[PDB]
Design a protein around this ligand. Structure first.
Ligand SMILES: O=c1ccn([C@@H]2O[C@H](COP(=O)(O)OP(=O)(O)O)[C@@H](O)[C@H]2O)c(=O)[nH]1
Ligand SMILES: O=c1ccn([C@@H]2O[C@H](COP(=O)(O)OP(=O)(O)O)[C@@H](O)[C@H]2O)c(=O)[nH]1
Ligand SMILES: [Cl-]
Ligand SMILES: [Mn+2]
Ligand SMILES: [Mn+2]
Lengths: 256, 256
């Protein structure tokens, strides 16, 4: 499918590492879809070159440029900078349907069946499960939707200072409407829950399709021993991320 | 409705305090339904007498008695003692439909609209939101369902050593089937989430219909200053619980 894509985002080199691991994981599990990444000019040439290899499309978004439609909203609401760059995922009208995935996600199994879903399909957020987590969602690119999202960001901002609040407010029927728009939690399995509700993880965690490295500490904030093949609680997913980073991404960075 | 009920559970005097506050809160918000409480012989005469006043029906369940259908399962799986007592909520076939509520819940608004729901309707659990939280659920009493639940408890036990695992395993279509069986989170608002995902709470918490005092520390494990009318983070709900306990329940205990 040349008209459907996974779309991720990186505004810097650190999240580009995640993007590269995510992209690699999607290729590893043989996606039949395109891979697109929103980037900013702050992503360095080296990360960019690697992103150009891993991804089928590298889109450059610069909301610091006043030529960008979101720039005036960034001025008004700096807290929404990442959110606003993220919203440009809706501008990818070369694609008919996309799965947005946070750059701190990791694919463990083919998830092309997400493309059966409609906008807006997303997994519940742990913590407040009547909100969906915006780290993984199925959406339909549309300039109108983009404009409407931008408009809401401008007018209301986001109840949580990020995209999740914004997306939940805009797609507010999610909690009460259409169970098919609730992506199984295994398609956006928060790394925290992989020890928060541990019995549930024991019971259902082996079904994980997507791990989402929530919280302050991202996989690249860890040190990884390449000999023992383990990072420096429950490091299983961290080690998968780092195995991909070590195996696929680091050498890729070295050929550029 | 004489055939529909809120059903709670207390196996001891401490949770009887919760039961009494819950029951009082349900009366406070003018439920048109019956109030039933499952109790064990371990609930003391004083708590019982108060329970007999607050609740329309006090049911005594004794799974330590070998005459109980669950007793043999308790022997096999002691971890399920509370769960097994709880399952007897399905034996309440005097009622056509019930809302089970944990004794550590607190009603903040009329929730009689829960009786529009079918078995099994429950709110998502924070932590693993493809499980429902079993602190509040709409169910239909049935000896068959009771027997089937008991059978599963006997054969598999519970993936989390409690009722939640058991109920989720038995009612396992919940996550993927019928959005109407997802009770809004506000009908079972985990006290933890009232600081875990705090922006969401700020945004939606004022809509709270039911507060669920999750975690080790229950409202009765707090000290409450009756003069300042506050307990000894975000004590709002604790103070509501204690206002009811102080105002309604304590004097009630004193008249028995
Ligand atoms: O400084 C940042 C912050 C986030 N992001 C992107 O926006 C998403 C926001 O999710 P993040 O993982 O940062 O937040 P969390 O999921 O931990 O709550 C990331 O995955 C990245 O794709 C980015 O590129 N640069
Ligand atoms: O020792 C106990 C433990 C629990 N329960 C009942 O079973 C429910 C189990 O939920 P609990 O609040 O204890 O667990 P949590 O919701 O905190 O995970 C309680 O609300 C009570 O109704 C009880 O009566 N005695
Ligand atoms: Cl539905
Ligand atoms: Mn993320
Ligand atoms: Mn409880």
């Amino acid at each position: 499918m040349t008209d459907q894509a996974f779309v991720t985002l990186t505004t810097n080199d650190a999240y580009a590492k995640g993007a590269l691991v995510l992209g690699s994981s999607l290729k590893q599990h043989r996606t039949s879809r395109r891979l697109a990444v929103l980037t900013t000019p702050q992503v360095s040439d080296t990360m960019r070159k690697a992103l150009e290899i891993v991804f089928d499309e590298v889109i450059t978004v610069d909301i610091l440029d006043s030529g960008d439609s979101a720039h005036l909203t960034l001025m008004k609401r700096p807290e929404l900078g990442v959110t606003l760059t993220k919203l440009h995922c809706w501008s990818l009208t070369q694609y008919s349907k996309c799965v947005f995935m946070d750059a701190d996600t990791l694919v463990l199994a083919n998830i092309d069946d997400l493309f059966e879903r409609e906008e807006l399909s997303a997994a519940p957020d742990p913590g407040w499960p009547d909100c969906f987590n915006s780290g993984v969602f199925v959406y339909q690119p549309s300039v109108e939707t983009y404009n409407q999202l931008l408009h809401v960001a401008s007018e209301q901002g986001s109840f949580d200072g990020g995209d999740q609040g914004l997306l939940n407010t805009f797609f507010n029927s999610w909690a009460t409407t259409d169970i098919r728009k609730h992506l199984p939690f295994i398609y956006n399995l928060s790394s925290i829950s992989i020890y928060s509700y541990l019995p549930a993880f024991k019971a259902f965690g082996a079904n994980a399709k997507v791990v989402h490295f929530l919280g302050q500490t991202k996989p690249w904030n860890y040190t990884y021993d390449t000999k023992t093949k383990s990072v420096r609680t429950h490091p299983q997913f961290l080690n998968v991320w780092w195995d991909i980073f070590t195996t696929s991404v680091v050498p890729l960075l070295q050929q550029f």
